[PDB]
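Our collaborator T.R. sent over the components below with a one-line note: 'Predict the complex.' Nothing else. No constraints on interfaces, no templates requested, no preferences about which chain binds where. So this is a plain run: every listed entity goes in together, and whatever single assembly comes back becomes the starting point for the next discussion.
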Amino acid sequence: QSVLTQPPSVSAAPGQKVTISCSGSSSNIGNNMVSWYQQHPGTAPKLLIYENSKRPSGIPDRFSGSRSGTSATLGIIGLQTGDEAEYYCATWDGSLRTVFGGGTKLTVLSQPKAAPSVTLFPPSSEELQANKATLVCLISDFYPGAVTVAWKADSSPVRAGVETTTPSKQSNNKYAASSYLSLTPEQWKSHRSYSCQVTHEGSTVEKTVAPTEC
Amino acid sequence: QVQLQESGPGLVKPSETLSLTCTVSGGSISGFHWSWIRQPPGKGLEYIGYIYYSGSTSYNPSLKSRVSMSVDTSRNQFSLELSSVTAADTAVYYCARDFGEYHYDGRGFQCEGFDLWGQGTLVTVSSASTKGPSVFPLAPSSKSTSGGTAALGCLVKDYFPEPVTVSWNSGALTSGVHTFPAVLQSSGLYSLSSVVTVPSSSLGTQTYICNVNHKPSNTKVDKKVEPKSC
Amino acid sequence: SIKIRPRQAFYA
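Returned assembly:
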């Protein structure tokens, strides 16, 4: 995992308050001060907080920051729809570089939470005839628009070969994403099954497929 | 009132060198440390390095074997050179102005954050070859007990550049259709999938075709998708 | 030893 760690997503209704954690260690937050950024997709990050707790001019007082031990916290009060964005923490690490947290998506709740629908397809016989294999995991109708995807080969985690899209807003205002697992035909044929496990709001929906012919 | 503006090539061939410049206006390079930060599409932020106005540098160890930066205080510009690029280097690149802590021992400047940012410039590492997709049918899984609903799909694999369109049954079928945004793969190529949910009852009386069009390559495929399994 | 604040020009 990266040097600084943040929860992938946080959400609350408009007018409510939230906090976002930034987990570090003695080599970073322990020794150096934390800055925070707000990023609306398609534009540059904007400085929100520096030196742990200070606000640049232009940043309203409902944004706050603190640091304790080897952790830091961003607080946001009076949530407005415009606050929806990706939030990042950062500081210097003793490995001799600035490091960023992985980012937290803030959603200002405007509709009911909805768990993802998951559909998983095995490699087609046509692809397998081209000596390739792709497992396709299609994830839809979820809200807030943040999921974490994990793949299993039999009962074991897989990391290599996974590419997952950013969630995108559907016409119905819920979200969609997809995750692709590239394998060799031998890998596909040599496991009894593969699973795509999608976690959303702490609940995991999973689908499984297995090699099958005539 | 200080503004930063990136300048860059847009497309770079794999293995070649990416060169960017940042122009500072309404202010000056003098007296500051300056950085590049990048963000692959849909991913997180990665600091690349810093350079002080006087020319001293520090680079992210992850990039040390490939990166350098320079400064032209006379033009109020600073630059990035990243060698031997691959698709992993496809990203929006930002220039920025730094703050943090300065030590008078060996530590020197510790960069804790970035107060001023450019707008960012996309750099795509690719041959830019036009490539039509392969189209694979994603057969509905075998399901009994009336079967309820069935999900059938098409995988539109390894094409460049965007976009691709997909319809089902020449547009006659829209209910239950969901075409997903593409993934950009480490190969530099795109793939996407489309799925339609249909009643199981008529899987034998209704033919399903996904109509794929990649206009850049004039690739048109009409792929029949049918239940498999013997 | 010393903080370099945002917007603070610094000449070592």
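Summary for T.R.: Chain C touches chain A at residues 3, 5-6 (CB under 8 Å).
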